[PDB]
Write a protein that binds this ligand. Structure first.
Ligand code: HEM
Ligand code: HEM
Ligand SMILES: Cc1cc(N)nc2cc(-c3ccc(OCc4cccnc4)c(CN)c3)ccc12
Ligand SMILES: Cc1cc(N)nc2cc(-c3ccc(OCc4cccnc4)c(CN)c3)ccc12
Ligand SMILES: C[C@H](O)[C@H](O)[C@H]1CNc2nc(N)[nH]c(=O)c2N1
Ligand SMILES: C[C@H](O)[C@H](O)[C@H]1CNc2nc(N)[nH]c(=O)c2N1
Ligand SMILES: [Cl-]
Ligand SMILES: [Cl-]
Ligand SMILES: [Gd]
Ligand SMILES: [Zn+2]
Lengths: 402, 404
């Protein structure tokens, strides 16, 4: 009674037995599927903790041992005396990697074992928090040879408020409301842009103004910190054979660092644990630049290309979008900044699936997010059936602190 | 009542119609199986309850719920099943059920058209030659010299005991798939099987990679018999490119009529194992999936070499550039041949409008996001940013086992 999962390109068949271990419940029922929705104490802290400790001791091939039973006993003793417990350094590293390994919407998981874990659980103030973040950005950027990383700030604990990064990513561009009712810059960042200004940021008026950080230490208001210009590696966009493209003045940044998600490990919660990888080119070309509710450049590019935008059957949108993606891949390669195209990325994710099937007997994967937003069926993940479910450790969404 | 958001515009709606969904799907709170193509697998007390449900909505759809023959029609079906074990549908019920089954198909992006459907009633057919003639009137009517019209032909319902009418081909028009001393296929690899069944039932094979297969039609109980399609009934389109002069020399073609002939129409508890339906193509079905899938004609590499694309590195997006032009050549060729076709932008835009109508009419719409979003340029179309609820309503088209 485990789901049978077929690849329709090749004919292979597997069964996802890992799904029967799904340590939480999602939004679907036998009556209706909600798979496409974007947003779907001591004794229970104890069972989450015991399950994680069991996982950790499996991964080091030491399950059911003395050191294993001791650690379980230590944990339930700590939860008795304090209502919580502290992870050892090696458990934190393993926990952070599993949460990446368990993220069902991430197509980059072939890399999950190569993660640099920075332990900032001794962090003390917003100012120290800024220092750790700058170090993260600089290590992860690495002059364009990007490295995956996560920095873990102190956990949620009773008595004190949370560390929070108010920005959804460490690097985002401002979005300024206009007189047209329109938006200058990134429309997805209007809210954080207004928050910054009302916390004392002098706004610019460009389309690619990098936003300051809003950092919150426990029981403190958020504090504003400017990122040093030379810390934020950016890439001017040009096209290899459409020379007018460089005159659009488009740019994107090197480092995708998500900073507003909650990291859950063995019952414990880290509301501030930003992590970074490297971009897949369609994130920039298709979503960030062509979405009508983002920079929405697609029709402007198509007009410049002398495509017939009068009629949809010329496929002018598909043509413009492929060329924007080409420009993205060419610009990053030219600037020597790590980037992966959706063909290579999905191919390596197929290898991840085969790796995971041998290791854990399955892989949580969200088909609608794994399949790229252009050229879906040209990639191998399109013809691969998938089973979505929630494993822990996990990265979870959390409400905005404001 | 599930909250459903459109992320492109910000609108929010509630799918109250999902509450009235019955036949359970494959998902559970612990794991989602929405991406699976065939979910799970494939005392006449049950027949009455389904029969009375179907009758009730029929009379709600014509206002007349409340006294009148509405009261009356519930009785005849009661009596008919009490006497015979099955029942027969009144002709307007069969039309209404056929339309609703289409309206309820969660994977269909063309449902804006659900009201305009021609229903050919072939329930009095009792022969294989009769089926064949019924099929040909359909193909002729549906094709209509290239001005395609949606049509379904309903053959007699399955009766308890004694066999089924059935069409063996998955579609009325399919291209041959021939193996060889390479293990590879010439023709359509998706139809390797039904060609095997075509030859072993007495068919003479063909030349190359665009040979229209014969129909394997099966009257109840006695084995299927071959039927050869008249060429002038099979409108095909040869594929050319508006500016790439060499594309035509590649020798590709596709047929005009997508007519599905292996699904089971279920109305009011009755099951019709032979009810072939047809509409018209979205161009990505031909360009992207039929011609470009690695397990189909797989032409993508050949078109890239002719375009002089850099096939040495994935990062040139040569696959994406070649695929767009194939689609452009499909749209162009069908327009030149005055054959009805629709691009994935127009189709998805119409489907958004269908979603809004259905919100007003029934308070929701079953939609399978992974099949509604086109296989190319997905996020460039409005359905991409539209959350959708998938569930089973009746009347419905279902998949069914193959007859071997
Ligand atoms: C190294 C290269 C990486 C690539 C190419 C990559 C790629 C992606 C992509 C394309 C998405 C979907 C986003 C979208 O389409 O809107 C995603 C989601 C996600 N990624 Fe990865 N990623 C990488 C590294 C990482 C790392 C290092 C982490 C954390 C340790 C991570 C965690 C996640 C999570 C949690 C999600 C889901 C976020 C959500 O559900 O909203 N990724 N990734
Ligand atoms: C009139 C123009 C029509 C268009 C453009 C259209 C388009 C489509 C497309 C693109 C699919 C997805 C198939 C795939 O890519 O695998 C589909 C599926 C389907 N269509 Fe439509 N179709 C049309 C008419 C019809 C009609 C007339 C009927 C029935 C009377 C119908 C019933 C279905 C069903 C039952 C499915 C599969 C649903 C499922 O598997 O749950 N369609 N259609
Ligand atoms: C480490 C990493 C590397 C990479 N290369 N890529 C990444 C993309 C995301 C990502 C996560 C959630 C997202 O979405 C959240 C959201 C909020 C509101 C509405 N829709 C969606 C999006 C963009 N969709 C991207 C997260 C991490 C990424
Ligand atoms: C009336 C109509 C019009 C149109 N314009 N288009 C249509 C496409 C399909 C259709 C239904 C099921 C399908 O899938 C069957 C299948 C078999 C094996 C593996 N997976 C899936 C496919 C192709 N995917 C197309 C059905 C009807 C269509
Ligand atoms: C409504 C829709 O399901 C939603 O906007 C999803 C669809 N699939 C996606 N897939 C990826 N990779 N990224 C996304 O942001 C989305 N958005
Ligand atoms: C594995 C995957 O779910 C499967 O290949 C589906 C995905 N979506 C699809 N969507 C359409 N329209 N047609 C298809 O054949 C498929 N294939
Ligand atoms: Cl981004
Ligand atoms: Cl087809
Ligand atoms: Gd040029
Ligand atoms: Zn589901």
């Amino acid at each position: 009674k485990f789901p049978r999962v077929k690849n329709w390109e090749v004919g292979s068949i597997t069964y996802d037995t890992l799904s029967a271990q799904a340590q939480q419940d999602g939004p679907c029922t036998p009556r209706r599927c909600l798979g496409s929705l974007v947003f779907p104490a001591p004794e229970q802290l104890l069972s989450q903790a015991r399950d994680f400790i069991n996982q950790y001791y499996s991964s080091i091939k030491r399950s059911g041992s003395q050191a294993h039973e001791q650690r379980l006993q230590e944990v339930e003793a700590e939860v008795a005396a304090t209502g919580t417990y502290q992870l050892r350094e090696s458990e934190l590293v393993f926990g952070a990697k599993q949460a990446w390994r368990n993220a069902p919407r991430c197509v980059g998981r072939i890399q999950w074992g190569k993660l640099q874990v920075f332990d900032a659980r001794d962090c003390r103030s917003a100012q120290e928090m800024f220092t750790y973040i700058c170090n993260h950005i600089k290590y992860a950027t690495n002059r364009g040879n990007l490295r995956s990383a996560i920095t873990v700030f102190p956990q949620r604990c009773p008595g004190r408020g949370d560390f929070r990064i108010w920005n959804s990513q460490l690097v985002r561009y401002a979005g300024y409301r206009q007189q047209d009712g329109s938006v200058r810059g990134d429309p997805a960042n209007v809210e954080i842009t207004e928050l910054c200004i009302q916390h004392g940021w002098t706004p610019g008026n460009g389309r690619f103004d990098v936003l300051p950080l809003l950092l919150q230490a426990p029981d403190e208001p958020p504090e504003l910190f400017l990122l040093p210009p030379e810390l934020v590696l950016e890439v001017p966009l040009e096209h290899p054979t459409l020379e007018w493209f460089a005159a659009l003045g488009l740019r994107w940044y090197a480092l995708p660092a998500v900073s507003n998600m909650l990291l859950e490990i063995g019952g414990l919660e880290f509301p501030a644990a930003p992590f970074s990888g490297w971009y897949m080119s369609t994130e920039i070309g298709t979503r960030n630049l062509c979405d009508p509710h983002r920079y929405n450049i697609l029709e402007d590019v198509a007009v410049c290309m002398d495509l017939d935008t009068r009629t949809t059957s010329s496929l002018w949108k598909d043509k413009a979008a492929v060329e924007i993606n080409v420009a993205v891949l060419h610009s990053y390669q030219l600037a020597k900044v790590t980037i992966v195209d959706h063909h290579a990325a999905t191919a390596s994710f197929m290898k991840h699936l085969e790796n995971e099937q041998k290791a854990r007997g399955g892989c949580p994967a969200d088909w609608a997010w794994i399949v790229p937003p252009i050229s879906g069926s040209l990639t191998p993940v399109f013809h691969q059936e998938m089973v979505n479910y929630f494993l822990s450790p996990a990265f979870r969404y959390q409400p905005d602190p404001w």
